Design a protein around this motif. Sequence first.
Motif, PDB file in Angstrom:
ATOM      1  N   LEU A   2       0.865  -1.236   0.000  1.00 46.40           N
ATOM      2  CA  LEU A   2       0.000   0.000   0.000  1.00 46.40           C
ATOM      3  C   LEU A   2       0.877   1.254   0.000  1.00 46.40           C
ATOM      4  CD1 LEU A   2      -2.889  -1.145   2.436  1.00 46.40           C
ATOM      5  CD2 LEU A   2      -3.069  -0.880  -0.057  1.00 46.40           C
ATOM      6  N   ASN A   3       1.905   1.267   0.824  1.00 44.58           N
ATOM      7  CA  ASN A   3       2.751   2.464   0.890  1.00 44.58           C
ATOM      8  C   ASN A   3       3.467   2.747  -0.419  1.00 44.58           C
ATOM      9  OD1 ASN A   3       1.967   2.726   3.679  1.00 44.58           O
ATOM     10  ND2 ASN A   3       3.957   2.034   4.479  1.00 44.58           N
ATOM     11  N   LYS A   4       3.780   1.756  -1.216  1.00 41.84           N
ATOM     12  CA  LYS A   4       4.362   1.901  -2.522  1.00 41.84           C
ATOM     13  C   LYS A   4       3.329   2.536  -3.479  1.00 41.84           C
ATOM     14  CE  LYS A   4       6.815  -0.634  -6.104  1.00 41.84           C
ATOM     15  NZ  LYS A   4       7.906   0.365  -6.121  1.00 41.84           N
ATOM     16  N   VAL A   5       2.088   2.071  -3.361  1.00 40.43           N
ATOM     17  CA  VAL A   5       0.995   2.649  -4.209  1.00 40.43           C
ATOM     18  C   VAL A   5       0.768   4.081  -3.800  1.00 40.43           C
ATOM     19  CG1 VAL A   5      -1.439   2.492  -4.912  1.00 40.43           C
ATOM     20  CG2 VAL A   5      -0.071   0.400  -4.730  1.00 40.43           C
ATOM     21  N   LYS A   6       0.759   4.386  -2.498  1.00 35.25           N
ATOM     22  CA  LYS A   6       0.669   5.709  -1.968  1.00 35.25           C
ATOM     23  C   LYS A   6       1.755   6.645  -2.567  1.00 35.25           C
ATOM     24  CE  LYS A   6      -0.767   6.669   2.320  1.00 35.25           C
ATOM     25  NZ  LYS A   6      -0.860   7.093   3.737  1.00 35.25           N
ATOM     26  N   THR A   7       2.979   6.196  -2.517  1.00 38.09           N
ATOM     27  CA  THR A   7       4.064   6.993  -3.099  1.00 38.09           C
ATOM     28  C   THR A   7       3.863   7.223  -4.585  1.00 38.09           C
ATOM     29  OG1 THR A   7       5.475   6.525  -1.348  1.00 38.09           O
ATOM     30  CG2 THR A   7       6.521   7.028  -3.520  1.00 38.09           C
ATOM     31  N   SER A   8       3.480   6.169  -5.290  1.00 37.85           N
ATOM     32  CA  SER A   8       3.269   6.229  -6.710  1.00 37.85           C
ATOM     33  C   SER A   8       2.155   7.241  -7.111  1.00 37.85           C
ATOM     34  CB  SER A   8       2.937   4.852  -7.280  1.00 37.85           C
ATOM     35  OG  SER A   8       4.049   3.926  -7.123  1.00 37.85           O
ATOM     36  N   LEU A   9       1.067   7.258  -6.354  1.00 44.48           N
ATOM     37  CA  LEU A   9       0.069   8.364  -6.492  1.00 44.48           C
ATOM     38  C   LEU A   9       0.597   9.706  -6.237  1.00 44.48           C
ATOM     39  CD1 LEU A   9      -3.170   6.955  -4.985  1.00 44.48           C
ATOM     40  CD2 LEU A   9      -2.903   7.724  -7.333  1.00 44.48           C
ATOM     41  N   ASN A  10       1.307   9.849  -5.123  1.00 46.28           N
ATOM     42  CA  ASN A  10       1.877  11.134  -4.702  1.00 46.28           C
ATOM     43  C   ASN A  10       2.797  11.673  -5.792  1.00 46.28           C
ATOM     44  OD1 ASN A  10       4.519  12.438  -2.626  1.00 46.28           O
ATOM     45  ND2 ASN A  10       2.484  13.317  -2.719  1.00 46.28           N
ATOM     46  N   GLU A  11       3.528  10.810  -6.472  1.00 52.56           N
ATOM     47  CA  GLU A  11       4.589  11.216  -7.415  1.00 52.56           C
ATOM     48  C   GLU A  11       4.003  11.259  -8.877  1.00 52.56           C
ATOM     49  OE1 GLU A  11       8.202   8.813  -6.368  1.00 52.56           O
ATOM     50  OE2 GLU A  11       8.369   9.902  -4.439  1.00 52.56           O
ATOM     51  N   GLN A  12       2.688  11.071  -9.027  1.00 53.80           N
ATOM     52  CA  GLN A  12       1.979  11.124 -10.341  1.00 53.80           C
ATOM     53  C   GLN A  12       2.558  10.133 -11.298  1.00 53.80           C
ATOM     54  OE1 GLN A  12       2.726  15.416 -10.240  1.00 53.80           O
ATOM     55  NE2 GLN A  12       0.549  15.866 -10.261  1.00 53.80           N
ATOM     56  N   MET A  13       2.800   8.892 -10.868  1.00 50.04           N
ATOM     57  CA  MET A  13       3.375   7.854 -11.710  1.00 50.04           C
ATOM     58  C   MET A  13       2.339   7.056 -12.486  1.00 50.04           C
ATOM     59  SD  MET A  13       6.700   8.069 -11.097  1.00 50.04           S
ATOM     60  CE  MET A  13       7.337   6.585 -11.848  1.00 50.04           C
ATOM     61  N   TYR A  14       1.052   7.256 -12.212  1.00 46.01           N
ATOM     62  CA  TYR A  14       0.030   6.505 -12.948  1.00 46.01           C
ATOM     63  C   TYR A  14      -0.544   7.505 -13.977  1.00 46.01           C
ATOM     64  CZ  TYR A  14       0.124   3.256  -8.996  1.00 46.01           C
ATOM     65  OH  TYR A  14       0.518   2.336  -7.999  1.00 46.01           O
TER      66      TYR A  14
END
Length: 178
Positions: A115-127
């Motif tokens: 979850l924390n990896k997905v959280k970071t990925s959202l935060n960093e606009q990676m999707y």
Amino acid sequence: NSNICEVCNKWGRLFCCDTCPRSFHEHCHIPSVEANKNPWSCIFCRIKTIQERCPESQSGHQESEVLMRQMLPEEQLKCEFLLLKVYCDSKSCFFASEPYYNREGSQGPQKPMWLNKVKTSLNEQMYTRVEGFVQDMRLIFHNHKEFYREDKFTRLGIQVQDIFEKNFRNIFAIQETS
Ligand SMILES: [Zn+2]
Ligand SMILES: [Zn+2]
Ligand SMILES: [Zn+2]
């Protein structure tokens, strides 16, 4: 306002929503609670405003169309909210931080996810599309099912995936089916 965090149900250093009674720890809110902004409106409030501005956004949708959407601001927000709905379940603790794999008779997943990896990925606009976020989320539970095999601990993956899927269907107004 409430005296416990909406997400983790503990007291502490809480930030209060100005437009509803909810409160949050700083890093329990997604996105993390904004430095200034008076008044401040929580993610629940922001999601409610979207629906109110476009009532037709609640008519049923096909999952396949939802997944292909680009991550514009409103879809970004909906994915943040869906992530936060998972963290609201206490069983999300098992999926929050980086896992490790050393169990007799099993091999770790080729692509770990948490979850924390997905959280970071959202935060960093990676999707770039909703599909990216939903694939990573479903990958968390699928890895858990495969690794744990016949151990009854597999059920924790089923349970938290169910929370994810109910909330996905609610937030993105997926057409109801039998
Ligand atoms: Zn909290
Ligand atoms: Zn609020
Ligand atoms: Zn409208």
